[PDB]
Amino acid sequence: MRVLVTGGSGYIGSHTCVQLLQNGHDVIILDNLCNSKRSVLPVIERLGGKHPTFVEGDIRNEALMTEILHDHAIDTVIHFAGLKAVGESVQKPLEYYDNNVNGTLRLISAMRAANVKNFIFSSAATVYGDQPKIPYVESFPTGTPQSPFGKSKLMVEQILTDLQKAQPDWSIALLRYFNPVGAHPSGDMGEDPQGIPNNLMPYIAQVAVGRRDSLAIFGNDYPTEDGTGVRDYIHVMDLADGHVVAMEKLANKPGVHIYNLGAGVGNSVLDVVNAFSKACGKPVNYHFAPRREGDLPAYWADASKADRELNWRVTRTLDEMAQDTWHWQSRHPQGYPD
Amino acid sequence: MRVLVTGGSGYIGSHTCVQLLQNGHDVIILDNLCNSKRSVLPVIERLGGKHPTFVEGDIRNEALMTEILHDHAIDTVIHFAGLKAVGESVQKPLEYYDNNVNGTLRLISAMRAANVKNFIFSSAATVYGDQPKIPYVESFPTGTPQSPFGKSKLMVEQILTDLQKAQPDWSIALLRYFNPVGAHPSGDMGEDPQGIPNNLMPYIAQVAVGRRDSLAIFGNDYPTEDGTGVRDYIHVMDLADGHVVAMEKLANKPGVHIYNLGAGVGNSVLDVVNAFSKACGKPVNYHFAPRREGDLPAYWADASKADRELNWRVTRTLDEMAQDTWHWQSRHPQGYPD
Numbered sequence: 001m002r003v004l005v006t007g008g009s010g011y012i013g014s015h016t017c018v019q020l021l022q023n024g025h026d027v028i029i030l031d032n033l034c035n036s037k038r039s040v041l042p043v044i045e046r047l048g049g050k051h052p053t054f055v056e057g058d059i060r061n062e063a064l065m066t067e068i069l070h071d072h073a074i075d076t077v078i079h080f081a082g083l084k085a086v087g088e089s090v091q092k093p094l095e096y097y098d099n100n101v102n103g104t105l106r107l108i109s110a111m112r113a114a115n116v117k118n119f120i121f122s123s124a125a126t127v128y129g130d131q132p133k134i135p136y137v138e139s140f141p142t143g144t145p146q147s148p149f150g151k152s153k154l155m156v157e158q159i160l161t162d163l164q165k166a167q168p169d170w171s172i173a174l175l176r177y178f179n180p181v182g183a184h185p186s187g188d189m190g191e192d193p194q195g196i197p198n199n200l201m202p203y204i205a206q207v208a209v210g211r212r213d214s215l216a217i218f219g220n221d222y223p224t225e226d227g228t229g230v231r232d233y234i235h236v237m238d239l240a241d242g243h244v245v246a247m248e249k250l251a252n253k254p255g256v257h258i259y260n261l262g263a264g265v266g267n268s269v270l271d272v273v274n275a276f277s278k279a280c281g282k283p284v285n286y287h288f289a290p291r292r293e294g295d296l297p298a299y300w301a302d303a304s305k306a307d308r309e310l311n312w313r314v315t316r317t318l319d320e321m322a323q324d325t326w327h328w329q330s331r332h333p334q335g336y337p338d
Numbered sequence: 339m340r341v342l343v344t345g346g347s348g349y350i351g352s353h354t355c356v357q358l359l360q361n362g363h364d365v366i367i368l369d370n371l372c373n374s375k376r377s378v379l380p381v382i383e384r385l386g387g388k389h390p391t392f393v394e395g396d397i398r399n400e401a402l403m404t405e406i407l408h409d410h411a412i413d414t415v416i417h418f419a420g421l422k423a424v425g426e427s428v429q430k431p432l433e434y435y436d437n438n439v440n441g442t443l444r445l446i447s448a449m450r451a452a453n454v455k456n457f458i459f460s461s462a463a464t465v466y467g468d469q470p471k472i473p474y475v476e477s478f479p480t481g482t483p484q485s486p487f488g489k490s491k492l493m494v495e496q497i498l499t500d501l502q503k504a505q506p507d508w509s510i511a512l513l514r515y516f517n518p519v520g521a522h523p524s525g526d527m528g529e530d531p532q533g534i535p536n537n538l539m540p541y542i543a544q545v546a547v548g549r550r551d552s553l554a555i556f557g558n559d560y561p562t563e564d565g566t567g568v569r570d571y572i573h574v575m576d577l578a579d580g581h582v583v584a585m586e587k588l589a590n591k592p593g594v595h596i597y598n599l600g601a602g603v604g605n606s607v608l609d610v611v612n613a614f615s616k617a618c619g620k621p622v623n624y625h626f627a628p629r630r631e632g633d634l635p636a637y638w639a640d641a642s643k644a645d646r647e648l649n650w651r652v653t654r655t656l657d658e659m660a661q662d663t664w665h666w667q668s669r670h671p672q673g674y675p676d
């Protein structure tokens with residue numbers, strides 16, 4: 001298939017692109033490089049075993065989007081582009097709504113213009129809001145995210161749903177990611193956060209690599225087995241693979257296909273720490289800090305639907321998620337070159 | 339004050355502009371004329387007794403917005419611009435999200451750029467969603483609107499709220515309108531819908547003027563006194579006046595000020611019909627049709643907050659709302675000239 005991958009040079013998009021190329025699709029990456037570097041492109045080509053086309057541009061540029069879609073005769077679009085720092089979003093709402101809500105609107109409008117009606121959106125478990133019923137199931141009604149970031153994702157899901165209602169031939173997948181971690185097995189590609197990492201794993205990795213002193217565990221008083229937060233960590237490769245399948249199976253299948261993408265099991269902060277200590281052969285230093293604003297105690301996905309409907313399920317373990325991250329972190333301490 | 343009135347040539351904006359000019363503020367209207375005509379400008383000037391500045395442009399044009407705000411040293415902005423046909427919104431979601439969500443985002447971003455932090459947004463009772471508790475009070479949590487239009491308004495309220503959180507010096511009023519009707523007493527200005535009117539009053543007026551055969555009453559089986567839908571109709575002049583006060587009193591008052599704007603009482607479809615028959619001296623023809631999709635049975639505002647805090651309350655009656663509309667409709671059967 002001819003697929004446009006927005007945000008294709010980012011963390012999850014890069015991994016998905018390698019998988020797409022492996023399944024022999026023709027990939028065109030669209031990224032503005034605000035959060036990634038061109039240095040990854042060669043790696044994606046190599047690991048993918050095929051050349052993906054790269055266009056530096058912004059999803060907010062509707063005219064460019066339209067031209068791209070036509071010029072490359074795109075069949076389907078995978079939309080990972082956007083801003084995603086939760087904390088930042090609170091301090092800078094406009095930027096989030098613009099890049100995520102308007103960004104997606106400009107892209108789908110371009111799609112409409114170019115007659116492209118196959119779409120896959122990067123959504124997030126935050127859309128469920130403060131849902132006491134766990135695991136989270138797709139049929140649960142959505143909640144109210146507590147940040148501009150989460151609200152921006154929910155708003156896009158709403159808009160896409162309404163778009164489909166109005167243009168029923170559209171096939172739109174809302175892929176709600178859980179907690180993506182891990183890296184390509186080669187250890188040549190991985191998450192490359194600039195500045196302080198906001199997520200657990202990368203933070204751990206930086207402490208482990210000697211860049212940071214101790215990991216601050218946000219809260220030790222939650223109602224969980226060990227008192228620390230619990231989440232559903234999913235390997236970036238399993239996510240990559242899930243996007244490939246979603247894209248292949250759902251193309252031309254009209255509707256709004258919602259799927260949780262996670263392992264379907266929860267792991268606490270200590271569990272992750274322990275898994276990393278084991279992978280890097282030394283104890284990861286850590287300390288207990290206060291609860292982080294907005295954090296829910298525990299949640300994980302109910303991923304049976306993607307299993308049943310797409311025959312998709314995670315295959316990598318927590319150990320591998322820790323090991324693969326350690327490998328990349330260790331093999332590329334300075335991340336992708338400038 | 340120096341105020342930028344977006345959508346100033348439209349129905350409610352035009353009336354508000356006359357009131358602003360009467361209170362001697364300097365008004366600059368920004369409208370794209372997609373739903374109004376330049377022919378109203380002279381009328382606004384005359385009735386306002388002062389010349390308002392007019393700029394044809396679109397709220398989605400951030401660069402223009404910014405230039406305008408600076409060039410005219412704006413102090414506060416009243417945002418009525420947007421698309422508002424509920425039914426249309428369902429058939430054409432993108433246009434609604436673009437003009438209403440992105441439209442507002444581009445405007446406030448321009449505001450941020452030009453250092454303008456006083457804002458008034460045209461919101462709507464739909465934001466309360468399917469709220470069984472009536473009347474609706476500002477402290478009730480928001481619900482889920484059933485159309486792209488209502489969702490677009492709720493999304494903007496969310497974005498504006500988050501913007502304020504991040505830029506605490508902003509004074510932002512979310513004015514939730516109920517059912518605006520009526521026209522300037524002169525009968526020289528009023529609502530000028532193009533095509534079939536979606537709202538009750540205008541529809542009635544067109545039947546009354548002989549343009550339409552009968553009024554279709556959507557549902558006669560609701561759980562209301564008379565079986566017809568019940569709403570809180572508010573005279574466009576009282577709304578105009580309420581915006582003037584809001585603007586004067588809230589300027590420079592940091593926060594998110596939410597106020598319901600309505601009469602605080604409900605009237606059924608028959609009540610309105612009867613009031614119009616009386617005003618036009620003949621029976622308005624009507625018939626019973628099936629419930630209109632998405633319609634709630636009955637709701638009205640609890641407008642005590644605006645009373646208490648802004649010392650604002652409606653002063654026009656239902657009769658006057660019917661009479662003033664009949665007057666305009668009758669004095670200008672073809673609406674504003676081309």
Ligand SMILES: NC(=O)c1ccc[n+]([C@@H]2O[C@H](COP(=O)([O-])OP(=O)(O)OC[C@H]3O[C@@H](n4cnc5c(N)ncnc54)[C@H](O)[C@@H]3O)[C@@H](O)[C@H]2O)c1
Pocket residue numbers: 006007008009010011012013030031032033034035036057058059060079080081082083084099103122123124125177178179180199
């Ligand atoms: N990593 C996570 O924990 C997480 C959880 C759920 C949802 N998501 C979503 O998945 C998507 C991919 O996440 P990721 O971890 O790979 O992030 P990332 O930052 O590594 O990838 C996003 C990419 O989009 C690009 N980009 C940003 N704004 C753009 C714009 N306006 N136009 C064009 N390119 C733009 C960035 O340069 C980057 O390469 C995002 O939408 C993210 O919100 C990820």
Ligand SMILES: NC(=O)c1ccc[n+]([C@@H]2O[C@H](COP(=O)([O-])OP(=O)(O)OC[C@H]3O[C@@H](n4cnc5c(N)ncnc54)[C@H](O)[C@@H]3O)[C@@H](O)[C@H]2O)c1
Pocket residue numbers: 344345346347348349350351368369370371372373374395396397398417418419420421422437441460461462463515516517518537
């Ligand atoms: N009339 C109602 O029943 C109702 C109820 C609640 C909320 N509102 C809101 O109040 C506001 C004013 O409503 P109204 O009845 O006067 O509508 P209107 O159509 O008469 O006024 C809106 C004006 O905005 C202009 N406009 C539209 N999109 C624009 C854009 N992108 N840039 C610049 N100008 C643009 C139109 O030309 C029009 O003059 C709207 O936002 C409406 O949603 C009204």
Ligand SMILES: O=c1ccn([C@@H]2O[C@H](COP(=O)(O)OP(=O)(O)O[C@H]3O[C@H](CO)[C@@H](O)[C@H](O)[C@H]3O)[C@@H](O)[C@H]2O)c(=O)[nH]1
Pocket residue numbers: 084086124125126177178179180198199200201203215216217218219228229230231269292295
């Ligand atoms: O330095 C750190 C970082 C994280 N945590 C804890 O680690 C767990 C995971 O935290 P983090 O990696 O920040 O994950 P989330 O808060 O779950 O957020 C991610 O997962 C969500 C879906 O589950 C998405 O909505 C978000 O965009 C994505 O960043 C939580 O209990 C955090 O309290 C710490 O104790 N210390």
Ligand SMILES: O=c1ccn([C@@H]2O[C@H](COP(=O)(O)OP(=O)(O)O[C@H]3O[C@H](CO)[C@@H](O)[C@H](O)[C@H]3O)[C@@H](O)[C@H]2O)c(=O)[nH]1
Pocket residue numbers: 422424462463464515516517518536537538539541553554555556557566567568569607630633
């Ligand atoms: O031809 C018509 C038109 C309307 N109605 C009834 O009249 C009442 C008022 O209907 P309408 O004028 O369309 O009002 P709303 O549906 O209440 O919607 C208006 O009021 C809302 C706030 O209350 C806003 O959210 C909307 O944008 C605005 O159009 C309702 O019970 C309708 O069922 C009829 O029976 N026949």
Ligand code: NA
Pocket residue numbers: 165166167428429
């Ligand atoms: Na339709």
Ligand code: NA
Pocket residue numbers: 193194195196
């Ligand atoms: Na960063």
Ligand code: NA
Pocket residue numbers: 214286287
């Ligand atoms: Na320590």
Ligand code: NA
Pocket residue numbers: 334335336337
């Ligand atoms: Na680096």
Ligand code: NA
Pocket residue numbers: 090091503504505
């Ligand atoms: Na802040």
Ligand code: NA
Pocket residue numbers: 531532533534
């Ligand atoms: Na019309």
Ligand code: NA
Pocket residue numbers: 552624625
């Ligand atoms: Na009849």
Ligand code: NA
Pocket residue numbers: 672673674675
């Ligand atoms: Na006319």
